[PDB]
Write a protein that binds this ligand. Structure first.
Ligand SMILES: CC1=C(/C=C/C(C)=C/C=C/C(C)=C/C=C/C=C(C)/C=C/C=C(C)/C=C/C2=C(C)C(=O)CCC2(C)C)C(C)(C)CCC1=O
Length: 307
């Protein structure tokens, strides 16, 4: 096996490629239409589900820029949001690109709160979307909740100046929370799968115990998040666990295990995952595809958002 051939296990797994499809339609619109479309989608979503605000401890790297935006005049505030949306080269747009996904989301959550109470320049009353933007908004409102919040997250994440041409820069993330209190941990069960490596992957992720979790991988192993390329090697995979994978709740329900070539094992689990942004408000339907070597170490795992 190679990582590239490991990618193809269980090829009838149908992922939700409506998500990148919708994002690409979104990318065709004007900056102002993009901001207004998301505002209208956000407001509609808030009728039924509520974002859990992040702790102030996780926003320490964004706090000063956020207060700067609030104190700006309305026209400056609108220009900052447009700059981010167009991925313009401005100081705020560069700083934004050094932030982890959760810091970026908290930044836009705070702006959205301030747009509601009138502190930040709101979407003009009687704003009219272009016909193409109107079609995108309706499409987004039609997606199931798990796919809706993934479109919204991926829009937020892709804003800011292109990371490729700020060169050497420190990527910044939320504090690394200590592993969960032992008495506070739960024990997953999976109908049809008792493989100890897969159970330990689930339990350690649910406990935020990334030092233990990373030891489940081969040194050259890889993890592939939904709609992304594989992250290769223990060092990069551990950075991703710390930067992006804290406070998830994984609820695998059932799975199947099959031999693969050379005493490898290929395992597919389906279930739900909750993000801390929404808790039980949004249960995302996920698949996990593991390729495990004869010693029981993860050579490859893909995580798919299901159609
Ligand atoms: C932007 C904007 C707005 C503001 C908007 C906002 C504030 C939008 C906020 C949108 C939010 C808060 C979106 C969050 C989604 C969290 C997601 C998809 C998680 C996936 C985690 C997963 C699948 C589990 C993943 C995984 C498991 C299972 C593993 O096994 C391994 C790990 C891994 C992570 C791969 C305004 C409203 C101001 C209007 C203007 C405007 O543009």
């Amino acid at each position: 096996f190679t990582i590239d051939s490991a990618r193809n296990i269980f090829p009838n797994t149908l992922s939700a490629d409506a998500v990148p499809a919708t994002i690409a339609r979104f990318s065709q619109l004007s900056a102002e239409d993009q901001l207004a479309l998301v505002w209208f989608a956000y407001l509609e979503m808030g009728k039924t589900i509520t974002i859990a605000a992040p702790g102030a401890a996780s926003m320490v790297f964004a706090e000063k820029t956020m207060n700067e935006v609030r104190q700006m005049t309305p026209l400056e505030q609108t220009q900052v949001m447009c700059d981010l949306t167009n991925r313009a080269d401005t100081p705020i747009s560069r700083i934004y690109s050094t932030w982890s996904a959760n810091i970026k989301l908290g930044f836009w959550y705070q702006l959205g709160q301030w747009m509601e109470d009138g502190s930040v320049a709101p979407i003009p009353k009687g704003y009219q979307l272009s016909a193409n933007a109107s079609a995108v908004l309706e499409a987004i409102k039609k997606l199931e909740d798990g796919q809706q919040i993934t479109v919204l997250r991926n829009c937020v994440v892709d804003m800011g100046f292109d990371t490729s041409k700020m060169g050497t820069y420190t990527k910044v993330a939320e504090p690394v929370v200590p592993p969960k209190e032992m008495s506070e941990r739960t024990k997953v069960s999976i109908d049809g799968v008792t493989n100890p490596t897969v159970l330990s992957y689930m339990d350690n992720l649910n406990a935020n115990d990334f030092d233990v979790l990373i030891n489940l991988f081969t040194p050259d192993g890889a993890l592939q998040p939904p709609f992304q390329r594989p992250i290769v090697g223990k060092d990069a995979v551990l950075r991703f666990f710390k930067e992006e994978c804290q406070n998830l709740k994984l609820l695998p329900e059932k799975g199947v295990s099959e031999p693969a070539q050379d005493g490898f094992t290929q395992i597919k689990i389906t279930g739900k995952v909750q993000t801390p942004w929404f808790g039980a408000g949004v249960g995302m339907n996920m698949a996990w595809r593991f390729l495990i070597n004869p010693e029981g170490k993860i050579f490859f795992v893909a995580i798919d958002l299901l159609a």
